[PDB]
Structures are given as C-alpha cells and as structure tokens.
C-alpha cells in the first residue's frame, strides 16, 4: 500500500513590462527566474522524484523576453552599470531594494550591514552593493559553480558582476528548455494558468463572491466580462502549444479559484484535472476527504491540495532547522499513510519561487533533504499529474457542485470587497466599456487587486502605475 504524493509547484509574474515605454520597472522576474524559475526543475536532474510545475503564461512571455535580451529592466541596468555612470535616482533605486531586502537569509552577507550602515558610498564600495544584490538571487546551479566569488562576500569587479551577469542570463535561456526536458523525460507534468492570472469565477459572476462573504460590499458590474474569461483560457491553451507543442489539458486555476461556472468553463475548454483548495472542499461537500480524486459532474476531475502540507513548505519550514521540518513531513505522511487502507492522493500545491528566500541558504539544506528522503522511502510513490490523473488504485467521489471561493480563507477578500480595491474594479469596469485591444486582459490579472488597499510599502506604487498603464492603453 503506497502513499501517492504530488507536488505542484505555481510559477507566476504580473506583466512589469510598462505598454508605452517597455520598460520592466521591476526586477522580479528577472531575480525569480536566475533563482527559481530554472533551478526548482533542475532539481529533478539529482533526485529521481517526480515534480510538477505550473507556469503562467505572462510569466512565459516575460521569460522569452529577458532570454531574448530584450528586456529593458530598470533596476537590473543599475545594477549593470560601472557606479560612475549611475544616475542619483539608480543610487537610490539600489539602496531601497537593498532595504527592502535586508533581513531575508539570502541577503545574509557581512558586507552587506557594513554598506547599509555607511553614511556615502565610493564606487568600490557601490560595486559590491550592485554585485551583491545580485548574488543574493543566486540559484542553486550557480551558487555551486560560482562558490568562489560568493565565498569572497566583498570587492567585487567590474568584470566579476559582469562575469555572474553572464551567467545569469545563460540560465534564463536555458529555462523553457528544462521545462520541455522533464515534460519528455516524464519527470513532470507542466500545467499553465488563465493568460494573466486572473479571477476566472469573478469575471464569469461577480455575485459568486456572496457564496462566502455575504456582507461584502462590491461595485457596480454593468459590463460582462464572460467573454474575456473563455479569452483567457484560450491564449493560454496556445501559448502553452507554442512552447511545448500540445495543448494543456491540466491547469492551475488561479488562487486555486473555483465556482461551479468556472468548472463549467474549464470543462468547455477541454481541460481535463485542475486543482483546488481544501477549504473549498469543506465549504462545498459536509463530509470529504482530500486524498480521492474528485470527478466534478463527471465533466472534470479535481484534486484538493492538503493545505496543511502545502502551508508548512509555504509558510512554515523557513523557521525550522532543516532536518526537523523534513522529519516533520514525512512524519505527517506516515500518519495519513496510516489512516486509511487505501491509498491516498496526497496534493501539495503552493507557489514556487516565494518562500526559499526566507529559508537559510535559499531552501537549498531543505529541499535537498526532502528530495534525498523521499527518494528512498518505498511506501511513498511521488506521481507526475498525468499519473495522478489516470491512477486506477485510489478512491474516488463525485461532486455536483462547489462553494465559489480562493485558497485565501476560501473567498475573495483579498481582490474585492475594501474601497480601494472596489476602486480597481470600478476603473477596470469602466476601461472594459471602451476597450480595443488584450490590454484590457493584462488589466483583469489578480495581481493589481492584491496589493491595492494594501497599500503601502515601496513599490506598490510601481503596481498601481502598471495597472492604470495597461487600463490606458487598452483604450486605445
Ligand atoms: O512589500 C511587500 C512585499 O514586498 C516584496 O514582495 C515582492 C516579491 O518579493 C516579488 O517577487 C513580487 O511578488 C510576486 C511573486 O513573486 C509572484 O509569484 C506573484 O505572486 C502571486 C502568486 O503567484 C499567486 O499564486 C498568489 O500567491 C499568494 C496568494 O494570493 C495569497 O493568498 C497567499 O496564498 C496562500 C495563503 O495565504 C494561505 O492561506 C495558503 O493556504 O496558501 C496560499 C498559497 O500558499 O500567498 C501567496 C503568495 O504570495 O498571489 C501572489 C500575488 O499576486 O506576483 C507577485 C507580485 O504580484 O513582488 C512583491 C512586491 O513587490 C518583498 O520582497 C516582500 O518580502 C514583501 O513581503
């Protein structure tokens, strides 16, 4: 009798790319691809599990972008340039994301307290503060290959910031191809999303909200947005087709977002299993378990993650010494592997790229145990989503119907329902009235709700100029 663990890795960014002047006015992607975006599958080169992976499809173009090095990144061309070319406002660029970066475990570099605690920086000085922001993104594949200038931790060059620079793109371009290696390899199933990650059940019903909050307060829909809900899901079936020359028939719904519409749709677009949150479940079904596969009016199966598994990875294990939190999982798979006398569909689903930069050595000690545990344990069978979906020795149950929600609580607080959230709403509703171009469907990513009303802290600025950008140029 085996344990079947499945793990789903989520990658995604909102498009930083701004419509009028091309500029990526945010580095994330760019650190978020040298630091996760290739090295989460490259693990799948040094341990023989299997994983998962969801890439957006906004992620991908951006991805394409950088490799392609058409990307203009405003904060990587500060970190690029001699610091006698740097213009007072990319000084001051680079200072701010250092602060903001200060206390994560990967920015752990001594150097790094002596320049934040110097009152004027020279240019040596400068230099080691471009070059060890940079490092402090490095993924595993280099954090090996380029042990000796991180174990230098200070007076860097010129030509050594270039030097990891280069390398870092090299990584970047070999990216989508890792994703196709372990696709064909069948180390992994890769899943896409809704183009940019939008709310689907919202843009299909907007009144599904009242499922779970019915106090919420939200404004005025007097535009339908059903259509640019199936849009979405259509791009991204082709992108998904450009890049790895199939159509997706697994996908992640965003924020594990679920309504019976949204179902419904997933259905029409021929989508075969997604997954979802177990609040829902238990918002949905009196009685249920998250370890059967779910067939959804016979028209869609869906899994529901163990949010406590995924939770601990997700949130959790970065406080942990590394051995521990890995006893502690396989702990709690051996009592779910004792609990029942069939065997369960275990789904750990969370984001891929945001926790490890809390975790020490960037969850390097953390995965490394886990995959080199997992590995040798012969009660647990770690399954690609094409053999959870087609396993034949697990139970399941059908469902008719399911309480629209998120895996934030299980509703949708998160995008709607505060004034200045509502307010994006109401711009965006407005903008869709008279929208001419897909624009208008950058402007539906979740991403511009989420940190509106939020507010506050630096570079939400940056998100709120992107949104109203893209509301703007939709419009024309
Ligand atoms: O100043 C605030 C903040 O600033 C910085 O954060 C920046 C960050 O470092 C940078 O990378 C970027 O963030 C990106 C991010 O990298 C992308 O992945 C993407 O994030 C979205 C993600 O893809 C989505 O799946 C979604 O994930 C969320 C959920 O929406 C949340 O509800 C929550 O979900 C969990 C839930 O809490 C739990 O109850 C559990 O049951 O399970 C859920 C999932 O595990 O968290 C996850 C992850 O955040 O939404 C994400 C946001 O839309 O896009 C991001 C940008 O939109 O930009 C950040 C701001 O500049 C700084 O680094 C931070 O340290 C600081 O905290």
């Given at each position: 009798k085996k344990l079947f663990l499945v793990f789903w890795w989520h990658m995604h960014q909102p498009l930083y790319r701004e419509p009028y002047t091309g500029e990526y006015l945010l580095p994330w992607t760019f650190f978020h691809a040298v630091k996760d975006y290739y090295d989460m599958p490259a693990y799948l080169?040094?341990?023989?599990?299997?994983?998962?992976?969801?890439?957006?499809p906004v992620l991908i173009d951006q991805i394409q972008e950088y490799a392609q090095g058409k990307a203009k990144d405003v904060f990587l061309?500060?970190?690029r340039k001699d610091p006698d070319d740097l213009?007072?406002?990319?000084?001051?660029?680079?200072?701010?994301?250092t602060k903001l970066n200060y206390e994560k475990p990967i920015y752990r570099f001594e150097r790094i307290r002596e320049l934040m605690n110097k009152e004027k920086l020279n240019r040596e000085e400068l230099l080691d503060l471009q070059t060890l922001n940079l490092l402090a993104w490095c993924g595993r594949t280099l954090r090996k290959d380029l042990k000796d200038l991180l174990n230098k931790g200070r007076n860097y060059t010129q030509?050594?910031?270039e030097y990891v620079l280069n390398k870092y793109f090299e990584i970047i371009k070999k990216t989508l191809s890792i994703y196709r290696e372990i696709k064909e390899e069948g180390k992994g199933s890769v899943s896409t999303s809704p183009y940019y990650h939008p709310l689907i059940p919202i843009l299909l019903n907007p009144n599904c909200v009242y499922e779970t909050t019915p106090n919420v307060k939200i404004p005025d829909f007097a535009v339908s947005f059903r259509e640019d809900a199936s849009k979405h899901v259509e791009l991204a079936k082709e992108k998904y087709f450009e890049i790895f020359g199939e159509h997706p028939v697994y996908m992640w719904p965003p924020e594990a977002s679920v309504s019976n519409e949204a179902l419904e749709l997933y259905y029409e677009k021929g989508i075969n299993m997604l997954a979802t949150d177990e609040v829902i479940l238990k918002n949905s079904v009196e009685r249920a378990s998250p370890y059967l596969r779910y067939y959804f009016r016979e028209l869609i199966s869906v899994f529901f993650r163990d949010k406590t598994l995924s939770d601990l990875i997700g949130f959790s294990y970065h406080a942990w010494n590394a051995e521990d939190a890995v006893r502690d999982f396989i702990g709690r798979l051996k009592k779910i592997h004792e609990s029942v006398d069939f065997q369960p569909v275990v789904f750990v689903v969370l984001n891929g790229e945001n926790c490890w930069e809390y975790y020490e050595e960037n969850?390097?000690?953390?995965?490394?145990?886990?995959?080199?545990t997992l590995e040798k344990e012969e009660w647990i069978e770690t399954l690609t989503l094409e053999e959870a979906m087609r396993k034949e020795d697990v139970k399941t149950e059908v469902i008719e119907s399911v309480k629209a929600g998120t895996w934030f609580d299980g509703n949708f607080l998160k995008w709607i329902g505060n004034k200045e959230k509502?307010?994006?709403?109401?711009?965006l509703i407005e903008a869709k009235k008279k929208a001419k171009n897909d624009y208008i469907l950058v402007a539906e990513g979740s991403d511009w709700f989420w940190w509106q009303g939020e507010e506050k802290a630096p570079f939400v600025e940056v998100f709120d100029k992107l949104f109203r950008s893209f509301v703007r140029r939709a419009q024309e």
């Amino acid at each position: 009798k085996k344990l079947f663990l499945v793990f789903w890795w989520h990658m995604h960014q909102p498009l930083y790319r701004e419509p009028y002047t091309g500029e990526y006015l945010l580095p994330w992607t760019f650190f978020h691809a040298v630091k996760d975006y290739y090295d989460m599958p490259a693990y799948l080169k040094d341990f023989e599990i299997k994983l998962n992976f969801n890439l957006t499809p906004v992620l991908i173009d951006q991805i394409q972008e950088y490799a392609q090095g058409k990307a203009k990144d405003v904060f990587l061309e500060a970190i690029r340039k001699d610091p006698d070319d740097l213009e007072k406002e990319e000084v001051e660029k680079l200072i701010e994301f250092t602060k903001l970066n200060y206390e994560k475990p990967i920015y752990r570099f001594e150097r790094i307290r002596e320049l934040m605690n110097k009152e004027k920086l020279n240019r040596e000085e400068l230099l080691d503060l471009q070059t060890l922001n940079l490092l402090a993104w490095c993924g595993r594949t280099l954090r090996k290959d380029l042990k000796d200038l991180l174990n230098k931790g200070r007076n860097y060059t010129q030509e050594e910031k270039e030097y990891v620079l280069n390398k870092y793109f090299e990584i970047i371009k070999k990216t989508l191809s890792i994703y196709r290696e372990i696709k064909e390899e069948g180390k992994g199933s890769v899943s896409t999303s809704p183009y940019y990650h939008p709310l689907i059940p919202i843009l299909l019903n907007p009144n599904c909200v009242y499922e779970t909050t019915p106090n919420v307060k939200i404004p005025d829909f007097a535009v339908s947005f059903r259509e640019d809900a199936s849009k979405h899901v259509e791009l991204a079936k082709e992108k998904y087709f450009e890049i790895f020359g199939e159509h997706p028939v697994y996908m992640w719904p965003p924020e594990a977002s679920v309504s019976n519409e949204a179902l419904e749709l997933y259905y029409e677009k021929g989508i075969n299993m997604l997954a979802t949150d177990e609040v829902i479940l238990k918002n949905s079904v009196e009685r249920a378990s998250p370890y059967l596969r779910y067939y959804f009016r016979e028209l869609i199966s869906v899994f529901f993650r163990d949010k406590t598994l995924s939770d601990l990875i997700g949130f959790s294990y970065h406080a942990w010494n590394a051995e521990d939190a890995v006893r502690d999982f396989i702990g709690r798979l051996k009592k779910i592997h004792e609990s029942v006398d069939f065997q369960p569909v275990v789904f750990v689903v969370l984001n891929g790229e945001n926790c490890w930069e809390y975790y020490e050595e960037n969850g390097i000690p953390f995965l490394e145990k886990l995959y080199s545990t997992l590995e040798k344990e012969e009660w647990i069978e770690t399954l690609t989503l094409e053999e959870a979906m087609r396993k034949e020795d697990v139970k399941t149950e059908v469902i008719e119907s399911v309480k629209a929600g998120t895996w934030f609580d299980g509703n949708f607080l998160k995008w709607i329902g505060n004034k200045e959230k509502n307010e994006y709403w109401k711009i965006l509703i407005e903008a869709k009235k008279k929208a001419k171009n897909d624009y208008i469907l950058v402007a539906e990513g979740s991403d511009w709700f989420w940190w509106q009303g939020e507010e506050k802290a630096p570079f939400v600025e940056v998100f709120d100029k992107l949104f109203r950008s893209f509301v703007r140029r939709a419009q024309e």
